[PDB]
Design a protein around this ligand. Structure first.
Ligand SMILES: COc1ccc(Cn2ccc3ccc(C(=O)NO)cc32)cc1
Ligand SMILES: [K+]
Ligand SMILES: [K+]
Ligand SMILES: [Zn+2]
Length: 397
């Protein structure tokens, strides 16, 4: 079956942040306006027996003094008085500032995504679901002791740690506009979790990693060759993108033969995202996102689908709805008919002025990247004594 994470307390908490506003509500309601929920299995957010239990789960990756800091920051914003100079210092050393500011529910908000992506992992492991979806999750920039890119808690890292600890190999696929640095960094020294991010990279653009470095870093220790990256120039469209990641996705599958696939499905590659970097759409005659998702799903490997970036909320909703519906069809087999027009629901007016499901947009370096990545794959396989037909993989290009 196919699972979605949601719940009343959960929705309220994914909607209390100053930067993502009510995106989670727009998304889950568009999913629900399209009569998609009955076809889906509700996966509830995980809860803990006690504070100590919550704490041990989060510090499987995040440092204790960082969890302390984030929780002190929520308390401080639930008070009216401002932060002491000493408290400012504490928060800065955890980068709890700038694009990672505090707000009254910041710890509860960060914890929720962890709660959802942990329940999603658990529903895959006990084989209740073949695929689970969590649009509240996907915060791939959070580091052990540092907030970054409005990510305070790395739900992905933790959902992944739970999968490998259930030989178990996980493929992480990161379709966001930004390089999934945190997730990549977390499994830098591990071969059982292969990471692969495709993204924009250019000077001064966040975060800075996922590209040629002062050549190409790709993992250390036994983790060597296990972190993959494809940085693209700006302006790329659906088909060029599709052709850029397609062979890489197929080859990672054949070579690695993953026990689980975790997909950060960040929506900021859309043409209508305020970033205006990539020209990806949500069209389904073809959307680069849909191509990739449907490819990943044809593999029949249990799969986690996560959110991430996306700062045009109605258009992120337009994509993630299509992804949801696609997943339902490629897993259960039954056809999903989606009206081209946005159905009436409480957020309908946000989708104006034309109320269409399609977003409103009109549509060499890569081969030197394909060749470099094929070599890296071969080195990965050789290091990890994996059997595979070199030619069969080579043909995919
Ligand atoms: C162009 O419009 C924008 C809207 C929101 C933001 C927010 N923002 C600032 C720094 C930063 C880093 C990473 C991400 C992200 O989506 N990671 O997945 C978002 C970020 C910037 C521009
Ligand atoms: K990415
Ligand atoms: K790795
Ligand atoms: Zn992003």
């Amino acid at each position: 079956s196919v699972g979605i994470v949601y719940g009343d307390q959960y929705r309220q908490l994914c909607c209390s942040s100053p930067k993502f506003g009510d995106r989670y509500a727009l998304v889950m309601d568009l999913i629900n306006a399209y009569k998609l929920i009955p076809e889906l299995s509700r996966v509830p957010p995980l809860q803990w027996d006690s504070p100590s239990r919550m704490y041990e789960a989060v510090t499987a990756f995040h440092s204790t003094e960082y969890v302390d800091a984030l929780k002190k920051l929520q308390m401080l914003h639930c008070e009216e008085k401002e932060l002491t100079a000493d408290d400012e210092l504490l928060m800065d050393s955890f980068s709890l500032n700038y694009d990672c500011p505090g707000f009254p529910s910041v710890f509860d908000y960060s914890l929720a995504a962890v709660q959802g992506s942990l329940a999603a992992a658990s529903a895959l492991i006990c084989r209740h679901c073949e695929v689970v979806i969590n649009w509240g999750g996907g915060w791939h920039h959070a580091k052990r002791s540092e907030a970054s890119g409005f990510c305070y808690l790395n739900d992905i890292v933790l959902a992944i740690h739970r999968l490998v600890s259930s030989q178990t190999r996980v493929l992480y696929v990161d379709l966001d506009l930004h390089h999934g640095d945190g997730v990549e960094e977390a499994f830098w020294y591990s071969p059982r979790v292969v990471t692969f991010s495709v993204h924009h990279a250019s000077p001064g653009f966040f975060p800075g990693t996922g590209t040629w470095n002062m050549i190409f870093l790709n993992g250390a220790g036994r983790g060597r060759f296990s972190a993959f990256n494809l940085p693209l120039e700006e302006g790329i469209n659906d088909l060029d993108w599709s052709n850029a990641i397609g062979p890489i996705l197929d080859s990672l599958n054949i070579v690695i033969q993953p026990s689980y696939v975790v997909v950060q499905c960040g929506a900021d590659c859309l043409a209508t995202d305020p970033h205006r970097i990539f020209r990806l759409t949500n069209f389904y005659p073809l959307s680069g996102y849909l191509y990739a998702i449907k490819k990943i799903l044809s593999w029949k490997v249990p799969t986690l689908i996560l959110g991430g970036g996306g700062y045009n909320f109605p258009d992120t909703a337009r994509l993630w709805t299509r992804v949801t519906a696609l997943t339902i069809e490629e897993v259960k087999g039954k056809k999903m008919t989606i009206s081209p027009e946005i159905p009436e629901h409480s957020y309908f007016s946000r989708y104006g002025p034309d109320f269409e499901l399609d977003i409103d947009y009109f549509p060499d370096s890569i081969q030197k990247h394909h060749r470099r990545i094929l070599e890296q794959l071969r080195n990965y396989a050789d290091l990890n004594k994996l059997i595979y037909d070199y030619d069969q993989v080579y043909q995919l290009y």
